[PDB]
Amino acid sequence: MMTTIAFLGLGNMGAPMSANLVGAGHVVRGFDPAPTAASGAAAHGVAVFRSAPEAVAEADVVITMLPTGEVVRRCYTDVLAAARPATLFIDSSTISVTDAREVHALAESHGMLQLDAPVSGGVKGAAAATLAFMVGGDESTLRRARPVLEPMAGKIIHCGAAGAGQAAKVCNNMVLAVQQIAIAEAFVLAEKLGLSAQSLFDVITGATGNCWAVHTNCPVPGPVPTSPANNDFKPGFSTALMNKDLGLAMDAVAATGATAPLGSHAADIYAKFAADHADLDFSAVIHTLRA
Amino acid sequence: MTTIAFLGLGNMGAPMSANLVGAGHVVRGFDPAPTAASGAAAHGVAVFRSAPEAVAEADVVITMLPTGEVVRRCYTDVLAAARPATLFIDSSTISVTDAREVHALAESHGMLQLDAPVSGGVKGAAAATLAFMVGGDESTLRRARPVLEPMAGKIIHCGAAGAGQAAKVCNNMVLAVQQIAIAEAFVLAEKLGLSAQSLFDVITGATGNCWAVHTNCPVPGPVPTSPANNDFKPGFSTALMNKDLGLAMDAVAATGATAPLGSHAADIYAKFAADHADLDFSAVIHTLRA
Ligand SMILES: C[C@@H](CCC(=O)O)C(=O)O
Ligand SMILES: C[C@@H](CCC(=O)O)C(=O)O
């Protein structure tokens, strides 16, 4: 299983992910253009390089954890020629399904194996190695990748061909967004009807409406003391991050001509909420329903 | 032996009253439809020509009626015929406003009263697995418990009068939103080239999981028992979901609440019910391009 891994993107996700790879005994060759990110990763054993091409030159596997499809595209353009032939590229960035398929084809045109493997779990999942990887690409390529993913992962799920990882994540998170708004509406309506928060909680969680947005992320303080509502709506899952994912869902809706009325409505709601509350947990959208 | 007047012997009322007979109660009935009455009499209910007659000898009076207006008119018709401290249980699904009005009216005559609307449908009614969501006094629920038990899989005290109705309407508004949201996810997935089984496996193991997908999956295959595999036979009909959402919209209006997605869901299902009232509510997956 021991492998030389180039890790491009050493931010809030990339840094802890890379540390777990070092802990598992891999040689990790890192690059990030932010020197503070690079320094922090070096402190936990990443060999940091001056450029992304240098980092990938001697690597069996190249992982990208980057903010957008544009940055992934630009990164692949900078490094693919530098990589040894038939190197495994894993993009664990969260990007559009369109961009994922573009960068996948580019990697394959350079003779590289490529997977999309975006993750859920956030920074906390990243530190604890409990992230869920949602993978698109060839099954044999995933087989080759498993030893590298396992030390970062709680779950690895194969979603289909290239882009299917991005697709699965973005579909789930659109539903989540809609559910978190709907649970918030339910709690505020209950409050105006004189139905207690604890009572509504007990019913919804015992009934057909139950979902993570209530049972774990309860947007009123009290029924779930661990939920962000009890900690000033500190993330958790920030509004900024949810808004990014909803943007990607709206990109997917636009590329496909799909009709997603509530998903699109939830996107508009989170886009407005992100303008001034980007730093709050996405459950804090409940504030928009009170007045 | 507690004697129970059951007013409303329709699709729900008939099987509920059969379970009460089966539990050893004396059941007195009224319904304006001769077929409903006859069918109930056939399983042991002593049917009377008028609601006031049914109520005369009753320790408990149960209503299962279509609207608040009918519930209200039934109460003013029968309250004077009832014995003092009779226990009235309305298991109709009506507005929280109407529920609290009829509760107040009944207690004004020295009656004890609960709202106890139900989830489970006709299937649940027959099988005695209904979920009663109850508003009223804890001590009144305790007295009612022996009567509710033979009809029920769950009995949940929701709070003071009207809280049963509120709890049910709030859950069903969330459910409608979830059922549409899951449908959108499956349609988007298909157009992205992500298989239904793959999306199913991901969502059910992730934060988006809910009954609308894990049990009511609106595409055939991943859950062989879901209505999608059986021509969208209810299940839970669009007609009934539409009725609940209408009540949610009455509650949103009465309170001045902000419920944008619930309201959007209500609009979608009202429109869908014009064409497909008889299909399971999960069938909404095929009306999104309208
Ligand atoms: C074994 C596991 C990866 C290892 C971990 O739990 O960190 C998996 O996702 O299959
Ligand atoms: C609903 C009740 C069970 C009564 C019964 O159905 O026999 C309970 O479990 O609380």
Side-chain angles (χ1 to χ4, degrees), chain B residues 39-48 50-122 124-167:
Chain B
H43 62 61
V45 177
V47 175
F48 291 85
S50 79
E53 287 169 72
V55 165
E57 305 304 323
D59 305 298
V60 181
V61 175
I62 300 172
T63 46
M64 259 292 335
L65 297 168
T67 66
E69 181 179 337
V70 170
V71 175
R72 177 163 60 257
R73 184 52 163 265
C74 180
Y75 276 38
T76 55
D77 280 0
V78 305
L79 278 163
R83 300 192 294 185
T86 292
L87 170 61
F88 275 74
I89 303 172
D90 187 36
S91 282
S92 311
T93 297
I94 64 176
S95 78
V96 175
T97 297
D98 290 345
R100 285 167 180 164
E101 191 187 326
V102 299
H103 170 83
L105 189 60
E107 305 228 317
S108 86
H109 282 81
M111 306 306 165
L112 302 182
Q113 200 274 357
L114 300 176
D115 54 296
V118 293
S119 290
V122 172
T129 61
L130 295 170
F132 290 79
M133 293 155 280
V134 182
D137 294 323
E138 275 176 6
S139 69
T140 302
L141 179 51
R142 190 187 58 245
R143 184 191 156 169
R145 221 178 192 287
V147 169
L148 299 184
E149 282 165 2
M151 297 179 287
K154 304 210 219 97
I155 295 171
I156 312 152
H157 192 212
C158 297
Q165 301 292 357

Side-chain angles (χ1 to χ4, degrees), chain A residues 156-190 192-232:
Chain A
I156 302 169
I157 173 156
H158 183 48
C159 299
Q166 299 298 348
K169 180 171 175 176
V170 75
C171 287
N172 177 80
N173 288 13
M174 185 174 66
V175 174
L176 177 59
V178 170
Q179 291 167 335
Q180 193 68 66
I181 294 165
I183 290 296
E185 295 177 5
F187 274 98
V188 184
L189 177 62
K192 302 205 206 300
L193 289 168
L195 175 63
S196 80
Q198 188 63 57
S199 300
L200 178 67
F201 181 89
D202 291 351
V203 175
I204 291 188
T205 58
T208 52
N210 192 28
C211 60
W212 184 99
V214 55
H215 67 61
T216 299
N217 223 39
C218 188
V220 302
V224 192
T226 52
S227 78
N230 306 274
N231 187 29
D232 311 293

